[PDB]
Amino acid sequence: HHALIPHGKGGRSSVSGIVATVFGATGFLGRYVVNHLGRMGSQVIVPYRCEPYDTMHLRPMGDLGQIIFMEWNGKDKDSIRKVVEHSNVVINLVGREWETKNFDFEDVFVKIPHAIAQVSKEAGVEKLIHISHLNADIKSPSRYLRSKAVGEKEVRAAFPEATIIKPSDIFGREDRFLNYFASMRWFGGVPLISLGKETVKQPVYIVDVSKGIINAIKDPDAKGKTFAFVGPNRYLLFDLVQYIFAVAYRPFLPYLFEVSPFEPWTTRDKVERVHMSDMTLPHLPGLEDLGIQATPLELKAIEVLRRHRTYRWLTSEMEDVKPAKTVN
C-alpha cells in the first residue's frame, strides 16, 4: 500500500521512498540512523518520549517536512500504532543500559520491542529492524543480555520477517563504551576485574552499524535474517583500555553507582558485560554481507578520545600511540 517510487539524486532534497519510524532515535545510534535516512531524503518519523528540547539535535538532519516528531509511550499500544501507520519501515533502537523506576530490563528489551513488532505487522510495515546485542543469550547471567535475547525471540514471533541486528559494543563520539573506560578517573585508577586479562572484546564503529542498518533496509534478502554486527578486530580488554587511556593522554593506573537516581555511572550488569568477553558467532551474516567494510578502531580512536586529552597531547608533544595488540 505505502509504496513510494524513489526519485532524485539521493541528496537532502531527493526522495528515497523510505517512510521510517526510528524508535529510540534520541540515542547514540539513533542520531546516525536518522542522519543517514535524512541525507538520502527519507520521511523519518521520530517517536519521542523526552522533552522536545532533547530532540532538537535531530531537526537539522533532514529537509523540510522530512523529520516528523510525534510523542509516543512504550506503555501505550495506540501511540505505537499512530506512529507506524504510514511507515513502510520501522527501526527499533529502544534500549537502556540501566533499569529505571518504571522501566525494567524486561520492559525495555521484551515488552516494548514485542509491542512495536506486533503493531507494525498489523499496520502492514514492510520491514522491521530490531537491535539486539552480540552477547545476548537466553541463559546469559546478565539481565541486560538475557532480556535482550528474550525479546529477540518474541520479535521474530510477532514479526516473522524482522531483520534482527546484534551489534557488539558500538563505539563513537557519544558512545558509552570508549568514553566509559576513559572515565575511570572518577572510579579511582582503572578498576579491571582480574586486571581484565581474560576478556577479549570486538568493538564496532558507530557509522558502520548505522550504515549497515540502512543497507539492511535496502537489501531485499536481509528480511528475516538475524544479522550480527561484529568489529574489525578483537582486542584484549586490558590492551583495549590501555590503548584508550594512551590516546586520551591519561595515566594508566591498572586496578554503588546503580544507587544513583540520576543516570547511573556504573551498572552491575554493565560491569559483568564489560568483563564478559564478546561472543563470536560465525553462523550469522555480518557487515561484509551488507557491503559495509569494517573500520578499524585505531583510525577512529582519536576522534572519540582526543577530546578527552588532559593538557598537551592534542598539540605540542602529540606522541603517536601505536595500535594495541589484537587477540586475533
Partner: protein
C-alpha cells in the same frame, strides 16, 4: 466534504489517499481547510435581470473591484457570467 479516510476534502479537490505516506503530516496537527467553498457561494448569488442587451460589471466598488468588462446577453438559454466576479446576468424574457 470529507474523504472516506476521514480527511476533509479541500475546494481544490485534494485529499491525501489512504496509501499516501504524506498523510502522516496531519497525525497530531489539523489540516488547514477553508470552510467557505467559493463555487458554492456564487451559486447562491441570484441571477440579475437587466433589459439592456449589453451590460458592464466592475465587481462593485469601482476601483475596489475588477477591470470593467462588458457582457452580452443575446444567448437565451445561457446566462451571461462575469469573467472575474462570476456573477450571472440575464435579459428578462
Amino acid at each position: 466534504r470529507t474523504s472516506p479516510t476521514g480527511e476533509k476534502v479541500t475546494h481544490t479537490g485534494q485529499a491525501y489517499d489512504d496509501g499516501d505516506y504524506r498523510r502522516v503530516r496531519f497525525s497530531d496537527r489539523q489540516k488547514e481547510v477553508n470552510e467557505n467553498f467559493a463555487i458554492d457561494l456564487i451559486a447562491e448569488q441570484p441571477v440579475s435581470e437587466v433589459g439592456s442587451r449589453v451590460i458592464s460589471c466592475d465587481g462593485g466598488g469601482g476601483a475596489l473591484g475588477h477591470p470593467r468588462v462588458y457582457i452580452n446577453l443575446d444567448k437565451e438559454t445561457k446566462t451571461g457570467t462575469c469573467g472575474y466576479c462570476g456573477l450571472q446576468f440575464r435579459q428578462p424574457h
